[model samples]
Target: TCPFYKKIPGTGFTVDAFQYGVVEGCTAYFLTHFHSDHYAGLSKHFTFPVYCSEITGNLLKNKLHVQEQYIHPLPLDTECIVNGVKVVLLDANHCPGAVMILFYLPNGTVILHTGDFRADPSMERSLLADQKVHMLYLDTTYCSPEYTFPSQQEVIRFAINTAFEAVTLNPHALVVCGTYSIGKEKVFLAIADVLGSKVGMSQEKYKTLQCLNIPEINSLITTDMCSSLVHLLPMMQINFKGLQSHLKKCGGKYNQILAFRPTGWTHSNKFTRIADVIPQTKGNISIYGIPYSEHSSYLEMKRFVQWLKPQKIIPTVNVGTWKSRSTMEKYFREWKLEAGY
Candidate 1:
């Protein structure tokens, strides 16, 4: 769903609420990851103690330039006491350095806050399914029945096949893959290899990849546009109008173009099959919106919620309106997991 941890309910402390900038009474601040939306309002002026995973701690220090003295990096899945309160950092399985924050209050309450995650199958065997969590602040971005996309590899393989089909007609055809600041590394990187082309991207994007923990990134980068026909850009820039102008800016270097825009939002629960992932076409330009979501699907979230069986499930996203949150509550009721049902 979304990573809006405005504040963890039971704990007075805030998670990624540096956005409020001046939460006067919280004794500590916990940052789940390095995403801009999660890390907003974190700047040089920050003076309070902050806690996060070690990798995220490095990102905050090097990327955000927060004062080193105040940053506390905890090892993953390990327990430690902060102000006599126990805490653990679990791998969120969302992006590199991302984590799910766990809090154990002295009153014997266990709270888990999943900061924008893609729930893994193995989560069912861990404390996640221990049936002990008193409260769960869930990532409910896809809390409805709308998102039922296939697995990540399934979508990636199909994206490769689509690329092969498009490139068969013209081997030198330009290929573009859209992405966020992080995550979705496999899709774009795999397409580049299939095309046997070096990847081209903005220097800022290139620098961001350097900051990440993705694999096999050393050889794929290309600074010069002419060195590679495969280009990676932000998702917002993958539309028809955007790609049309992009091809025009190339000055005939490429006569035709194909773009893969993969995101969970691109999918629908009504999709008949993985092959039914439809593509929009206009002239020689094609946009394939793969259901390659980095977030959990509805089915996955249901499994997560049922197994966890938290006494209370709180929606972190799509809660702007009572209507939206109530719809998710309806789904939760259907799962027989609402209000400790």
Candidate 2:
């Protein structure tokens, strides 16, 4: 932590919050996104005029619940200067408000900090011409060569089909599953489509999807339209048969129940009051693990880096995640590394 104390004297950038006086010397602060990891510390430390895009500002104020001071919301491609630093907010292509920032220093040295992003073809096209970009901070959550997961839509289809089967087996059962709003909303929507408008996910999930303002499935996100087949959608649940046991229980008497974990690592114990997971393989009654993530693969990372042709690249998504000793230079230097701190 002590090593993180180094700073650019005139720029007024201190790595940590202890130097409150140093913070007062800064020009402006740029928040790449509203996620806790990205801006939580700044919400406490840096009070210099804050900068973000309009959608990001709305999420920070409305979703993450950050306070507003000298917040400036820039539209896409809008360039602004803070002190001597020229900054521009570009689309990150990951989520609605996420952004990739192009920072130009007084010396004409350019550094691009890419917050979490994906390789949407249009985004790649938009950034290809910035040949002078000297540095890039990237997201490398799946940076390994062998990592793979189904597409978001494919994972949703798998989960939905499994849940639909459980519901069909026991149409009256109390089916409930775990799904968060940001990433898993589509799974429930797909289920609803096949279940004949008979499904509803958790209220929070529904609201989360609506808040995102997605253009495709906005109509399907409403839960008030929930019908008798609603249990097929991910929702809150009480004690019900385990995935495998539920199928057996379906043979007896019960509404079909299905609950999938966020990842296999997440274990839901809401039913422990009634029963514990005994480990039974019932293919029909449960949808447990569906591959989905918010970050990109290493191949995507390499392609994105090549596409941007940035002079330097930084890895961000693995800020606090990697377990072993790692170096950004092992892949790309000029990386923003938390471990280095």
Candidate 3:
């Protein structure tokens, strides 16, 4: 299904496959973040030394209950040696404590595993000046030209403003914003801080956001509907079935319910340069899609490749079959680039 258990040639380190059950005997392992897709299958009873960012390491130990002895914390931009290979951690800018790994092989070649990242100027400059990356493990989630999107900062601003405007226009209406459990707290926090409203969330979501210690969040469980005008729900809840169910349960208390989803897939065309709030309605319930994403867009990925100029480009997702490989090969060739071995 997903590309996991990739072995770093000539190094004993394995990247982002703890859940696969195949890397148990590897000398060392690296975790990019706490996202379940990457961190699935990690457990408290495990003895393998798992390396990750400090925040992720803490989540693994505290939330996942992984034993402390096997957790290794690596600070961003710090270089260290692991099993005779030089390694450095850099900010991925995708989520909290998500890191892009740069490995200096014993043979003097460099490999970069971009562990679900959006391009950062400082990181690009650092790689361009000092490291000549031989192989790039890319996050090509939206690797087609149709996926161009505005910067995340701009999208977040638009999302917060849209939510505020919606709430202001329709007083007494419940504004339910869709977001992931982690990563997109910036949108929710900004909405709450700007609107001076408390956010309703699940108990688990509250605990996760509590780790940030931002007082402005004012997040609480969803039991009390009168506590706030805004309810922060998971992104999946914005869909037709989920929204229908949500409205059946929560709609009677309010005059109306408005839902907003901040994601990359809102735009249907490439001519647009900025995020727009697209609206959808299921009977009486309304939902808006705001363009905001943590991963690189297709244009961004192409630009990233142009800047880094790695000799080999490795597609991290959709790589299990020859058809997938051929498709990636064709993509790189069309872009006037080469796919990594």
Candidate 4:
């Protein structure tokens, strides 16, 4: 079921868009992040003003071709009002510029829309000190216990250490890291720091990192392939055939290629632990899928719910179907019993 857009009865504000278009009677819009799934229908010619993080605003203007005037950059932890509704932005901890939206309704109800985030300690502490949440739109991406995995930091550390081992094994090989076009900057940065090397990124990726204005990253980015020992390429570009061809094009410059893909899908089963590598090899290329997801696991989600203790849990899954909603609600009830709330 679609849970992207929710209408607030008397209010005209909409959070995220559904049906690849704006909701009818929408007076204001809030974009949780720049993920395509969240902005499917958005285009360069969008007419309405949008509220989002600073980096996301840059993405809207430069990449999505949205007008600069219509993009409102909301600083993290700051409160702002638009069209009479009080709003605050909190770091979603999913990706850079991702935010969870908190809406303080005029009627004294507090609504929290967790727009794709992971369990974060600082965010948890901040929420504990704030007003009680009346309703919660939770990101239940991994609402089942089958998603038990190590923390994201553990995964990243594994990746950094493994990349070094790969290079140590094959000095003539190129270390290729697979990542999304936008998110997963942390993985690349960690590798860069550990290897004491610069990162070679695509033009698009470089531009996005530049917009973030982080000095540590800015000084370590490069477009030239030979500028660094490792290359941070988009996940879609790290296939076996393509990488083989790339190595062939390099002549004898590199004898082998090691590819690391950090994603949730890497975990073949719930029992798969951190650093459990899946050998996806072809010819002279070796690919390993690492468990480094940004979303919270089932256990983390359970703890978050226990902490917030919202009056109702609204799952952000496919809410259009009664079956899906009911299934999620059933899980919530079971969780409540477990929490003894």
Candidate with top TM-score is 4
Clash-forming residue pairs, model 3: 313-340
Clashes of each: 1, 13, 1, 3
User: Candidate 1, residues 105-204: lDDT per residue as tens digits?
Assistant: 8888898989889888787766555438888888998887777778888888898888877888797589998877677788878888888877898877
lDDT of 3 at 202: 74
What is candidate 3's lDDT per residue for 295-323, written digit by digit as tens? 88877777778777777888887666787
All candidates' TM-scores? 0.89, 0.67, 0.86, 0.92
What are the runs in model 1 whose C-alpha is more than 4 Å off? 1-5, 9-12, 127-131, 249-252, 267-272, 337-341
Model 1's alpha-carbon lDDT is 0.80
Rate residue 223 of model 2 by lDDT: 61
TM-score of candidate 1 relative to the true fold: 0.89
User: In model 4, which residue pairs have backbone atoms overlapping below 3 Å?
Assistant: 1-318, 1-319, 1-320
Considering summed lDDT, which 10 consecutive residues are worst modelled in model 2? 265-274
* Whole-model lDDT values for every prediction: 0.80, 0.54, 0.75, 0.78
What is candidate 1's CA lDDT for residue 108?
85
As for candidate 1, its clashing pairs are 1-141
Task: Provide the RMSD of all predictions against the true structure, rounded to 1 decimal.
Answer: 3.1, 8.0, 3.5, 2.2
Please write out the lDDT profile of model 4 over residues 1-341, one tens digit for every residue: 32444555446777777344656778877888888878677777788888899988988888878888889898888778878888889888887788998888888989888999887656677743578888888898877767777776788888888878877787787878887756777777887777778888778877777776576666788988776877877678788877887777665789888887777744475566565655688777898777777898887888888878888777775566787777778888988888887
